[PDB]
Amino acid sequence: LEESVEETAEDLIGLHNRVRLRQSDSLKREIIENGKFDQWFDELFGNDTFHLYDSFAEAETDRLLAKLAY
């Protein structure tokens, strides 16, 4: 709830590849635009297993449980 879906994915992506894509700032722009992002992305989320919540615009209780049940 406290971070966009891209930010939680950002953590997951780095975590899978045993790295921190939040502190190495030259490497962030490099490995993504070169072809190592698409590589890891398919390597990780390709199994269609990961699902996230996208809003950050203060969800209501039965505007979350509905989505959580979904």
Binding site: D25, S26, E30, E33, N34, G35
Partner: protein, 639 residues
Amino acid sequence: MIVSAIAANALLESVTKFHCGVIYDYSTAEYVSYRPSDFGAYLDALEAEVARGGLIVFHNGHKYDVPALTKLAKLQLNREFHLPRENCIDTLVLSRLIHSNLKDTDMGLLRSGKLPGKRFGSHALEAWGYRLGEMKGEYKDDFKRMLEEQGEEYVDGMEWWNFNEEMMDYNVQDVVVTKALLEKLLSDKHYFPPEIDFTDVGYTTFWSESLEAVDIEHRAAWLLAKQERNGFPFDTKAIEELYVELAARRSELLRKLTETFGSVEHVVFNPSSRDHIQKKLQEAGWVPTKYTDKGAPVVDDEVLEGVRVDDPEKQAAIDLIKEYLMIQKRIGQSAEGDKAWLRYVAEDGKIHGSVNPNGAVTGRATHAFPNLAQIPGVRSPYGEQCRAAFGAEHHLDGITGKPWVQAGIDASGLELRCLAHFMARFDNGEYAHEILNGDIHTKNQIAAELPTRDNAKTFIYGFLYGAGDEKIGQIVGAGKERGKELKKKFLENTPAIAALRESIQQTLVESSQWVAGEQQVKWKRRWIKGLDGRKVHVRSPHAALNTLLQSAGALICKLWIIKTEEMLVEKGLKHGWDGDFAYMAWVHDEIQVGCRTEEIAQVVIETAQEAMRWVGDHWNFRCLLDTEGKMGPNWAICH
């Protein structure tokens, strides 16, 4: 990716017709030959590789082939032909990058008799053909000897005046060595990772999967080649108006310098050639102090200032000789030289000083014909006139007719800030903030205990670059006694510097040992990683620091001058004398940019600073980098 090489009638200055060219495609795995009527189809084949997003392989193409194909397409086919910088590669540049250390290695190859002595140091195609074993013969020598023996002599390059079926075959010969040299460079995994076959990828992937230095070098060589074609506007009349004032001064002095003396033999001596001052001072009663390795006494500017003789006329004549030698130097650089400036002024009124990019072990390029990076400064005699001759004001605008304005921007204290970056790892940015706080020469003075700040300035650079203890002691008028204690005291007050040589020595290396007065400094690792990741073979651990900092400083400037122009193009300005600005000269940490209006120069100055901060941000520099700009007509004002 395709590999090619061309054949023209002459050099970039007066090339008029395209002869032949061969294109080997890695997808088709077959060569294609073109002839002087197939020039049109040749330009199409290169565009097709651009449309697919591939690469075009040339040897010396960034400096010659590509701009020549730009020039040839305008006068012969009346079509605009321009290869983008992103989808063209120059093996010659990569050769200077990957194998800067090769000769060196060539000593055994030179002894082998495999590699010609005239190609001892050349990165040229012919020099590489024997290295790959692909040289079946050279077109340069098989023509010259045919001019002697089979009739009619020759002067300078006539084997290109017109096409011949042997040229069409030696055009292929130039291509297959280019292909093999490319694969020899792609097989070096320090720059090109093995997981990617660069012989079969798109241009977007090639730059990104390669080492950062690879990308910079092609941007650097492309940029500097533009500067050569931009050239430096030159006031011919002014230098001519100086040669008159100097030759007259030389002639009047020559007359006067025969008034004090006084000389199977004859006699005519004048102030030149070591047999001159040596022959007279050993008659005025001068005992030489410092000698040379051959035995001859030292006769330089240093000792001449201190030469004291009992003869007042001889003594007063010393200062007259001091002037004479200096007069010859300026004359010998601007008029009376084989590479004099007046000889290189083209028909446009500009001097096109050439530049070999990172074809120089570590960082800063090399300049020659003429060396634009050794014009006497404003602080030296007659340099004010000299620097004034190199100015944007000496080139009027092809449209408005106005004198362009020059913008001079240098890297503020680049050397010490690079030092602050590598030592901020041990003092947590202490020394780096001392730069920003200002008066780093004041702190170095206190740290090394020097009487004046100027003594600290001359100390910090000499000490950093591996100076003896005598030379350090001579700063305060002493020897190795004060020198050893001056350096040891500086190390104690600046721990980070010593700890820096730990991390370097723990990278790791070997160990050294002295045997009876011989420096036997061995090593295990003779290659330092740069900021872009290139190999910097450096030297013995006795200094090495100088190479690390100068590699850092010059590679920063390379990115700096690249990012500035990219932003200027991004901001909308146009590069070229028909545009708004033009790169004229790059000197270590300073550049000279011609500008159509004063307003444009102001943006250039700000843009140059913006690029310098981006470079510092890109490589996560531990210390802050900055620049200072100066606006004016010529070089004597912008520096």
